[PDB]
Structure formats: C-alpha cells, structure tokens
Amino acid sequence: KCEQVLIEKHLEIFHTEFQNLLDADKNEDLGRMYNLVSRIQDGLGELKKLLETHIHNQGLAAIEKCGEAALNDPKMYVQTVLDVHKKYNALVMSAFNNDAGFVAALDKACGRFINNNAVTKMAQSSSKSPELLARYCDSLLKKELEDTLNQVMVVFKYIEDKDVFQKFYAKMLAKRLVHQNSASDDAEASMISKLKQACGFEYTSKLQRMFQDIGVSKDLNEQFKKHLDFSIQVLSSGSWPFQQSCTFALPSELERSYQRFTAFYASRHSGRKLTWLYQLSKGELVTNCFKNRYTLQASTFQMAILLQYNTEDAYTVQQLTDSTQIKMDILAQVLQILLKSKLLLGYKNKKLRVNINVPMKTEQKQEQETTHKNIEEDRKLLIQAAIVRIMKMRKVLKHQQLLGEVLTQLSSRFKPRVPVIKKCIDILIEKEYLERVDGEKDTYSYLA
Amino acid sequence: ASYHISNLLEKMTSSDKDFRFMATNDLMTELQKDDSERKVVKMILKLLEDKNGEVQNLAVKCLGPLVSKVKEYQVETIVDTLCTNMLSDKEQLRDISSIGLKTVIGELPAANVCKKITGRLTSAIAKQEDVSVQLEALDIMADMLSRQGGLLVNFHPSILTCLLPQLTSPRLAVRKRTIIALGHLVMSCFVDLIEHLLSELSKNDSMSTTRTYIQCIAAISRQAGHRIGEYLEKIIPLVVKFCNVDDDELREYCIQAFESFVRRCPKEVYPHVSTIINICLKYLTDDDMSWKVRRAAAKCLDAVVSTRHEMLPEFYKTVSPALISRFKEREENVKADVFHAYLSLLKQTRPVGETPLTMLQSQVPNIVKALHKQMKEKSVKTRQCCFNMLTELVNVLPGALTQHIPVLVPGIIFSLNDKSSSSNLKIDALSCLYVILCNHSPQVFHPHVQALVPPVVACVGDPFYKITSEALLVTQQLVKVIRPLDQPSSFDATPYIKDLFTCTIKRLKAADIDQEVKERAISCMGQIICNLGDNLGSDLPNTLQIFLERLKNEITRLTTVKALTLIAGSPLKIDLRPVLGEGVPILASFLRKNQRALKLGTLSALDILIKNYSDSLTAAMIDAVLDELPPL
Amino acid sequence: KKRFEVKKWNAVALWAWDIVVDNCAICRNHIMDLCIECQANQASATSEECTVAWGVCNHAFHFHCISRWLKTRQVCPLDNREWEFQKY
Ligand SMILES: [Zn+2]
Ligand SMILES: [Zn+2]
Ligand SMILES: [Zn+2]
C-alpha cells in the first residue's frame, strides 16, 4: 500500500526526475530511486521503456554529434562507443546491481542504436558497424590491451551481422600475415582463444588452416636456408582469399631468385603450378646516388615503377602502362600518391629511415563494396543450398513451415529477407529442381 | 519414441552429409522440446573424428545440452576419451577436443568430472616439451577457476604446488596465462593457501627479481585485495628499495600502489608512498619511454584522491596541489590525466584549522593563469578539458572568478569563433559561458556585451540542435543579465534589441526544427518580451499570434504557457488586451485532459493575466472559465 | 645514370594443382570459362551468380557441377574423398 500510494499518484514526477537525473551525471540518486521502486510488484514496464528510449536517444545524439568525420575516422567513433558502453556498465553495476531485465534492456538498446543510427541512415547500408569494429581492431593490433579487447568482444555480441565481422577479420588477418607487422604473439593467441570460445569452429577453421600453412611455409624456408637477401611465403589457393593478379613484368635483376625456387619446387613437388602474387611484397632500397643513404618501404608495384626509370633517357606513362600491363586507375592513383611525398634526386629528409607505405585512400571504398557484394551472394547461395537440401529428408511440407525452419536455422547468423527467399525458391523451381504439384497450392514435391 | 529413434539412427547412419545434418537438427529440436544412450554416445564419439566441419560443429553443439538427459555412468568415460584425444598429434583434433571440453563445462552447472579433469591437469600442467599443451591447459584451468571453485577440499594444494614452477617459463604468454589462472584461483578462493603463496612470493623477492613476481602480486591483489593487511608492511619497503634502479622497471611498482589504495582503504602508510609517487612524477630524460612512466603515477594520484576524503587539509597544505598545477606542460596523455585528477579533486571538495575555502581562494589566481597559459594550444582535447575545468571551478562555489573575466573572455571568444572547433567543444564553451553568467553578478558583464553579443548571435543559427539550444540558453541568460530589474543599472542596450529579436523570431518558426530548439526559442522570446518588450512596439501587436497558434500543439504547450506567465508578471506593462479575447478560450479548452503540470501552468497564466490586465473582460470567457472549474 | 639495388623481396606464392587449373573434370571445358548448361538457358541471375567453389583438399569446381554430382556420390572426381565446402 505504501509503495502504491507513493507511486500511483506520482508517476509523472517520478518519470520526469528519472529523465532529468539520467540526462545529468548523478548515479547515486538513480540507484536510490531504483531501490525505492524495486519493491513494486509488476510495475516496472514503464521505467524499463523510459530507460530504453533514453538510451536510444543518447546513442543517436552521440553518433550524430560527430557527423561527417566518424565515417572516415573510425578510431574516435569506436573510442566514443567504448566510453559510452563502459559508462553504462559502471552505471548498471552501481545502481541496478546487474538486474537481469535491466541488463536485457541495455543489451537490446545497444543492439538498436548500433545496428541503425544517424551515420548508418545516410549511407543507406546497415552493415557498417562491423566494418568500423574490424578496422579499429586491425589498427590496434597493427604496430595493456586485454581490457579493450574483452570489451570489444562483449559489445560485439549485440551485433546481429556477426558473419560480416568474421569475414572482415579473416581478410585482415590474411593481409596482415603477409607482412611482418603483427603485434605480440600473446595478444594474437588471446584474441584467437576469445574468438574460439565465442564464435563457432566454422570461423576458426580458416584461422587454423592459415596458421598451419604459414608454419609449413616457415619450415620449408628454414630447410632451404639450411641447405643453402631473399624470402618466400608460399600460401594455399583455397585457404587465402586473394583476387588473381594481372599481368606483370619480371625484373631482370633477380630473375635467378625465382628461377631457382621454381626449379626446386618442380624437383620436390612436381605437377603443381605456382602463381606468385606481385601485390603484397615490401622491402628496402639501398640508395647510393643520393646525398645520403636512404631506405624506402616499397611494395612491388611502385618499386617496379621506380626501377623503370633506371637507364632511360625519357619516361612516358604509355610505355610503362603497356609494358607492366596494369589497370590505368590503379597506376594513376599510385603515381599520384608517390608524387605527393615529393619523391619523384637531391631532396633530403628529416630522418634516415622513412616509411612511405601509406593507406590506399582510394581503393578502400571499392574493396569494401566488393566485399559487401561478395557477402551478399554468399548469403544467397547459402540460403539456396539450405532450402534445396532441407527437402532431402522432408518429402512434402508447407511453405510457411519451410520459411520458419529456414529462419530458425540461421537465426544466430542473419535474418534473410522474404523476397530474397521467394526469388531463390522460384529460381530453384525454374532450374528443374522442383515440381509444382497441382493438388495443393503453395506446395512443392522433391525432385532429383 | 523407440521406433522414431531407431529410424533416425538407421537413416542417419548411411555415410551422408545432408542426412546427418537433418538428423542433428531433429535430435536438437527433440532435446530442446539404457541402450539408446549408449548408441548415441558411441555415434557422437565416432562423429567427433569425422573430417567434416559442419558435422563436427553440429555434434559439439549437441554435446552441450545432452548432459542434462544422458546417464551419469558414461560421463566419466567420455571425459576420459576426450582427455586422451587431447594428447593427439593433429591440431584440428586438438581444437575439436578443446571446443568440446569448453562446451560441456559451459553447460555444466555428475560432479566427478571436475575432480577427474583437475586431477589429470595437475600432472598435465607439469613440464612438457610442447608449449601449446601448456597454453591450452592454462586456458582450461582459467575456465575452471572462473566457473568452478566450489568445495575443492583437497585439490587446491596439488594444483598450487604444480603450477608454481610454471611461473618461470621463458615465454611471456605462458607467464601471463599462469598469472591469470592464479588470479582466478584467488578470486574463487583456503584458510591458509594465500599464506603459503605470499610466503613463497616474499622468499622469491629476496633474489634476482623479475617483472613476473610483481605482476603476479598485482594480479592477485586486484582479484582479492581484502585479505592482505599484515603483509603490506614488508611489501612497500621492497618496492621503495627496488624503485632506485637505473633500468626501466618501476612500471609495475607504481601500478601496485593505486590498486593497493583501491582495495585497502584504512592504512597508516600513505605519506611514504605519496612522497614516493610525488618524486617519481619528476622523471624527464617508440624508443623513448619517459612520456609513459608518469601514467602510473597519475593513476596513483587519481586513486589516492578518490579514496581519501577525511584528510583534505593534509592534501591541501602540502605542495601536492601546487605540483599538480605546475605539472601541466606535458604530453596529451599526461595533461589529460592531471586534468582528470584535478576535476575529481574539485568534485570531491564539496562537503559530504582554516576551512578549505581560504586555500581554494588563494590558489584560484594560480589556476587562472595556468589555464590561460594552457589556452594557447590548437588541440581540441585541451580546449574541452580547460572548459570543463572552468565549469567545475565556477560550479563549486558562486562568485569565484570575479577578477579574471576580462582576461578569460578572449579565450572563450576565440574558441567560439574559430573555424576548427568540434560540436562538443562549442557545446561545453556555451555551457561554461552560461553558468558563468548565471553564477556571477551582472556587474562584471556590462562592458563585455559588445564582445559577447556578436558570437552568441552568430552561434544561435547552426544546423545542429544541441548547439542551437545551448546558444538560446546563453542568449536568454545574457538578456536577463544585461537588464536586471532587481537592481537599477545605467547602460543603453538599444543597438542589441533588433540584433537579438531577429535571431529570436527567426528560430521561433517551425522550419522542421526539433522540439527542444523550438521550446528554447519560445523561452527566449518570453524572457525577452517580459524584461525588454517596451522597445519592441511595431512587432508587439502582430507576433503574439505565434503563441496562440502554438498553444494548440501538444509538443509545445508548457513552454509557451510559462513564457506567457513570465510576460504577464512583468513590472513593465505589456499590451495583451487584443490577444486576451482570443487567448483565454484557448487556455480554457485545455482544462479537460489529465496533466497536472499543464493544468498548473495554464492556471498560473490565466491568474496573472487577469490580475495584471482586467480592463476589458467579456462574459463568454468568464463563463467558459467557470464551466471548466468543476473538471479541475 | 640513376641506379639503386634492392636487398630483400619477400615474395608470396599461390600453389595449385595443374589439373584443376587446366580444366574441371565434371564438364570438359576451361575452368575459367562458364559451364555450358547455365549458358544454354539465360533468363535470370543464374548466369551471373554461377562461380567456382572450393574445398579442404584445395580443388576448384563449378557450383552447379558439384551440386549435380551430389546425390550420385559424395566424392570429388580426381582425389577420392568426401567433398567439403569452405568458401565461395
Ligand atoms: Zn553453372
Ligand atoms: Zn563445370
Ligand atoms: Zn578434391
């Protein structure tokens, strides 16, 4: 009776005080009134709803405040998100003492304001938060840090599109394993263990396969060095998603280096062709013509472009374009990015060691769009395969039951759209994989 | 059913992938909603060795909830078989076994499995050629100690003495896993175990020390620091005598201090460690590290300021606030952390042999010139920190900075007029300006109106809504301050009339503007009218219809009523008779819905209107008001 | 006139079976080229969504071909083990 009278006629002022206190930084009073109202029997729905909408409003305001910059600067956006998440966690610990209902309310609130927000709204794509998270993780691990990794792993659980982050992280790991620029092995092992505990074996299978491949590559390199500067990192075709490289011109200065490796591979492992990738291979240049010895971290492409200037009276874009046989846009962007550093002798530098390796800044958007599209047809093919193979045991079933089973099976992965599933079913029928029975409508019978 | 399970086993056992998938889906659905158990356990064990990934995933996911209904006789058998396969050669089988063990322990709340696994791992954790086995075993033990940790009547000493030699492993990763396992163990922890652990640590301290021992001590203290009170008196002297070393090893030593204060509050050893950290803040000689050693000292200062409350004169009378204030010209992290420490101290200064007011007042000029020197930086973070510092210094007590407004105004003007400024920076600058204008007397803001009106007016119109609302608040506060009716003033504000009115009426229109900005504009208009409207005579008898048409809207009904109430209760006469005829029925029509705040507001508005203005009153409005009284 | 020397290369290799890159066993055609039955009837996005699959044994085959081979056996033609799927 006391709680009823104190609350039933005081809902408006209590809710206003809740909103005002939550807007400001005052957690002790929030916990005080949470203790005050916790004695109510089944009357907390309004308070839960009010906190949920306020958390949504705070997320929207924080995300929209840093507009036009969080799109290209994921670092500060992820830092702000982590700060907000840890502030809410501390508030919950201090006030709500880890109430299960309130914890669930916070969880779905974070899910809501992470899946969609002001930044997501203008981009017309609700798949950007995993991209920012993966970029932040890669930059953090690209050369004390266990707490931030644990918090990131915890907050990732709210993201429904987990396969997006899994594929992104796998691609970033595959790219990063080429160049010796990873962090300490302890941090990598801890992250692998955390992903193994959280994510299923499907994601970690590729990671373990790549670890085994790099291990055997290192063993083979060590054995060759024992039998015998140069290095080689052999990778499998089905374990490293890499787009096929275009035509390229082999430099004549180190042709024997590739000839000997090819001969050794043919002698040892015959009947297996190799396709070296001339895109990800760095090194240092020993300059002597300059005023002082200088070193540049050069990738294969612009290193070959620079080498194309040795012993040539005249240089033209067309001749190197038709000799190297590379796309014009990539060539132009590389030339612009190398000319921006005032490199293309006589110019000095502040430090003896520079590192000209810089982000592409132009192909990132194209690569991201390509990866998103690839994930799209991956989802389409996966759902098509699931639909066609479900009917192997189930002879005949209704359309609604099949749709429900498909939704339930991949519920932890993603929520496919109804029109996409309908189109997949229709094209499967058109591909002679189904028969339309005339006895019942919206019914199909399995066919070989 | 017996026939159903027999058919499922027969159809599934046909060397098929899709059929196995559907059978696994079926049995998981059945589980969710004597010989059969043996058969399914055997077939799951067979599937555990299958090369397929999806089938193995399905089996390992099924293994979790299967423990609920399976018998308790073969659980030891399957655990032993999994442990035996854990020592295999193929890494994929190793990963599968680890996933299975983690899954079953996760779904576990029969209890012999924990004893068996810990007994086997006691021998497994011992020295072995492979290091991967040790890492996996340490991860498993950490999982046990995080989840299990119940009775363990005669198992803690064995695991303890077996894990002790593992602390000296050359690999840093193995050392970290052992430290994490020990921390989990002490957190889960018994009456004497920590005694032998601390005795061994102290004995090992008097040897060739390494970061491992200090890191382990810090970890066990952080996990459980409420049971170390009699050992400290030999812990601090060791840290002090080991701090005077040339090589860079003081990091963990300084990290120990803040967690020590956080865990154990009552201890009479504060002055020595405080002096140690005060001296250690002075080191000033990525290859360079000296820009990071002060982070631990700053965290130490944060912790000691937060935990201590009853010895404010001891902190204040010393050179500690002085040394904190002068130590500002450092890196971004150091500057941010000292600013955080000072903000925490000022927040603590509020009450919960001179009083702290005297020393605060004497240090105010020092803080002022330090902040003014710190203003000359292009970094946004420093500007936000300085504005938060000013806001805290003004909020703590009223009339604090009454002698530095002329020198602090240009900084605010520059931070508001610069093109390179974030939204948060402008918001906090406007909030600081508003709070300064509110707390301080109007007498120290008259000469600065010529400098404060243009930037505020310019900032009123911005695409953002938070910035616009804060600018409207600042405008209303400035309007109230410039013309205080409480005490007579001698100043001419005629040029600012139109300048404020243009922006105030511009923001009063809909213009698809958010509710908060519209309400702030309505409040600004109400205050401006109430305290200044005699100058506005041309637009007075035609702009009042905006309030009348906005009264119908539910989104803006309280703010307009409050503005009307403020306008009516103004000592200076405001012409409202032509609007009174068409306004009273509008307010009367709202006396039907259940809204206490709106009811009180509109009652106050009508009361003040009839009190101040009663020359012209018809009978229809009086009858309407009277008829609306019984529902109220 | 201007010359310089490179110290290290650190190249990357991608190994694959000669038979797989030569042609796919199921349909006697170039693996790069699209299969025949898909191009025989082009009326939807099948001609574009068709691609080459992958497995544990590092063997590349068309999705339609391997799908058709399924339910006749569960083996890849030239390597004699259970077919596995890892990436598209
Ligand atoms: Zn095809
Ligand atoms: Zn084919
Ligand atoms: Zn094969």
In short:
Chain A is mostly helical. Chain A contains 19 helices and five strands. Chain A has a domain at 214-268.
Task: Describe what this molecule looks like in 3D.
- This is part of a larger assembly, with chains A (448 residues), B (632 residues) and C (88 residues).
- With 448 residues, chain A is mainly alpha-helical.
- Chain A has helices spanning 2-8, 11-23, 27-37, 45-65, 74-96, 100-115, 118-123, 129-141, 146-156, 162-178, 185-198, 201-227, 255-268, 300-307, 317-324, 328-339, 363-390, 399-409, 418-433; strands at residues 232-236, 272-274, 285-287, 434-436, 444-446.
- Chain A has a domain at 214-268.
- In chain A, strands 4-5 form a two-stranded antiparallel sheet.
- The longest helix of chain A has 28 residues, at 363-390.
- By secondary structure, chain B is an all-alpha fold.
- Chain B has helices spanning 2-12, 18-32, 35-48, 53-69, 75-86, 91-107, 112-124, 132-147, 156-163, 172-188, 193-205, 211-223, 232-243, 250-263, 270-280, 290-307, 312-317, 320-326, 332-348, 356-374, 380-396, 405-417, 423-439, 449-460, 465-482, 494-506, 515-532, 540-543, 545-552, 558-568, 577-589, 596-612, 619-627.
- Chain C starts with a strand and ends in a 19-residue tail after the last helix.
- Classes of the chains: A mainly alpha (448), B mainly alpha (632), C alpha+beta (88).
- Chains in contact: A-B, A-C, B-C.
- At the A-C interface, strand 1, helix 13, strand 2, strand 3 and helix 14 of A face strand 1 and strand 2 of C.
- Strand 2 (272-274) of chain A pairs antiparallel with strand 2 (11-17) of chain C.
- The structure holds zinc ion (3 copies).
- Residues 24, 26-27, 35, 62, 65 of chain C line the site of one zinc ion.
